[PDB]
């Protein structure tokens, strides 16, 4: 029959595990901590110039810290460094990477100083690159402190003028200290594209267009590159979509048992509901993946590898790829919107962080807490303490990881700008994770 089973040698976020989350999620083991609304403040240094030229308060969104190769928070001349997407909502479609810095001793949100944008509007047109001159927006990624002590950035080149073309891009961020308490962005070098999809392993923007993606409601992604090191090799783990040969999108995917899990009755019943319903196209187009590529020492592409995990039929969008080694095991994390998912019981308000454990970097990834659920955030987008872009930050010692996120902060009264959310702790024990109760940290805190 049309029924088949194709794993493609890779792990999968299965429908059976996802349908079990609703009846599991209502627990303080998974619930994102309730944040105290009165103590929420804007980032004081989040000042910037709008597209008009006037100085205004910026909305600060997705943020990532400068990391050591193993994932721990780096120390740069006595400073912790955070890269963050920021911009003016009055110019809705614009995100630029800003550099925030804080002395290691300081703790408050007021202590975070702003070095400004990493790139000038001119920087993208300087080097000889096949993609950079088409960039409309700067999107998320990662930052690593090299063995040479250089600030190495990885981010996403987004092109709105090229049908939403997303390219994994790198640059060395040249720094200086004008005084004893100030970091300055001097400029950038080694600014170049690395990877934008191959077609077979990861979907290109051309295939998106060619299948009529702009009308069908397809979501093309190739973003959020996260740097990691293992056995002397250098990798980027990133949000992507499957190519033609590792489980492509389309109707046939709904017949693939590997994406369902569970028993045959579950497969037959879940498939039947999916083929009949209004979620048929949505599930068919859903082919999210967490991809991995190896890099050369100069940070160019070395090898395009098969994905670590896919979310075929489940969702087309698995965001903020995160990976780190702990207790000899490899942990993989992803943020997911319930509004993008096709699962019964999961709704528009549900926002998740999912987690997976493997014995090797490229081995079989098994779901944490049985289902993959690690964090559940279901606060209305209108709430002041709404949080998004949850990211697990590994620590030097202890079993706890620090969770960072941005708080939209859209209240009717001041303060009212998207800011650093208060951080919190999550305990990791084997294939089990739990939120540490009543340990709410300072806004944008990286370490404990
Ligand atoms: Ca897709």
From TrEMBL:
Gene it is expressed from: sacB
Annotated binding of substrate, by residue: 61, 140, 223-224, 317-319, 337
State what protein this is by name. Answer: Levansucrase
Q: Which domain of life is it from?
A: Bacteria
Recorded hits in InterPro entries, A to Z, give: Glyco_hydro_68, Glyco_hydro_beta-prop_sf
Reported cofactor(s): Ca(2+)
Instruction: Give the first-level EC class, as a single word.
Output: transferase
> Which positions in this protein are listed as binding Ca(2+) 1?
218, 249, 287, 316
GO MF term (any one):
metal ion binding
- Which organism is the protein's source? Priestia megaterium (strain DSM 319 / IMG 1521)
Q: Name one GO biological process term.
A: carbohydrate utilization
Looking up CDD domains in the UniProt record yields:
GH68 (cd08997)
Sorted keywords for this record are: Calcium, Glycosyltransferase, Metal-binding, Signal, Transferase
Q: In this UniProt entry, which residues are annotated as the site Transition state stabilizer?
A: 224
Q: Where does Ca(2+) bind?
A: 218, 249, 285, 287, 316
The annotated active site, in chain numbering, is 62 (nucleophile), 319 (proton donor/acceptor)
**Which positions bind Mg(2+)?**
196
Q: What is its EC number?
A: 2.4.1.10
Q: Which family does it belong to?
A: Belongs to the glycosyl hydrolase 68 family.
Q: Which Pfam families match?
A: Glyco_hydro_68 (PF02435)
């Amino acid at each position: 029959s049309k029924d088949f089973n194709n794993s493609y040698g890779i792990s999968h976020i299965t429908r059976d595990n996802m349908v079990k989350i609703p009846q599991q999620q209502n627990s303080d083991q998974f619930k994102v901590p309730a944040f105290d609304e009165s103590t929420i403040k804007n980032i004081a240094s989040a000042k910037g110039k709008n597209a008009s030229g006037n100085t205004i308060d910026l909305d600060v969104w997705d943020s990532w810290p400068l990391q050591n190769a193993d994932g721990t928070v780096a120390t740069y001349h006595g400073y912790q460094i955070v890269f963050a997407l920021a911009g003016d909502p009055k110019d809705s479609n614009d995100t630029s990477v800003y550099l925030f810095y804080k002395k290691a001793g300081d703790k408050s949100i007021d202590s975070w100083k702003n070095a400004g944008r990493v790139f000038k509007d001119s920087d993208k047109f300087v080097p000889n690159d096949p993609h950079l001159k088409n960039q409309t927006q700067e999107w998320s990624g990662s930052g690593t402190l090299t063995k040479d002590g250089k600030v190495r950035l990885f981010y996403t080149d987004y092109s709105g003028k090229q049908y939403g073309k997303q390219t994994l891009t790198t640059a060395q961020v040249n720094m200086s200290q004008p005084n004893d308490n100030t970091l300055k962005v001097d400029g950038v070098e080694d600014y170049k594209s690395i990877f934008d999809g191959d077609g077979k392993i990861y979907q290109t923007v051309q295939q998106f267009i060619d299948e009529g993606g702009a009308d069908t409601g397809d979501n093309h992604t190739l973003r959020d590159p996260h740097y990691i090191e293992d056995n002397g090799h250098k990798y980027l783990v990133f949000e992507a979509n499957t190519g033609t040969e590792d489980g492509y999108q389309g109707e046939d995917s709904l017949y693939n048992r590997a994406y369902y899990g569970g028993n045959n009755p579950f497969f037959q019943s879940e498939k039947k509901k999916l083929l009949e319903g209004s979620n048929k196209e949505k599930a068919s187009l859903a082919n999210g993946a967490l991809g991995i590529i190896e890099l050369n020492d100069d940070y160019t592409l070395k090898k395009v590898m098969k994905p670590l995990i896919t979310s075929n039929t489940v969702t087309d969008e698995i965001e903020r790829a995160n990976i780190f080694k702990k207790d000899g095991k490899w942990y993989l994390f992803t943020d997911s919107r319930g509004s993008k998912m096709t699962i019964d019981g999961i709704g528009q308000d549900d926002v998740y962080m999912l987690g997976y454990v493997s014995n090797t970097l490229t081995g079989k990834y098994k779901p944490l807490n049985d289902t993959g659920l690690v964090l559940h955030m279901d606060l209305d987008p209108n709430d002041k303490t709404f949080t998004y872009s949850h990211f697990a930050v590994p620590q030097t010692k202890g079993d706890n990881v620090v969770i960072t996120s941005y708080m939209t902060n859209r209240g009717f009264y001041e303060d009212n700008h998207s800011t650093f959310a208060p951080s919190f702790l999550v305990n990791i024990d084997g294939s089990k994770t739990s939120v540490v109760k009543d340990r709410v940290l300072e806004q944008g805190q990286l370490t404990v």
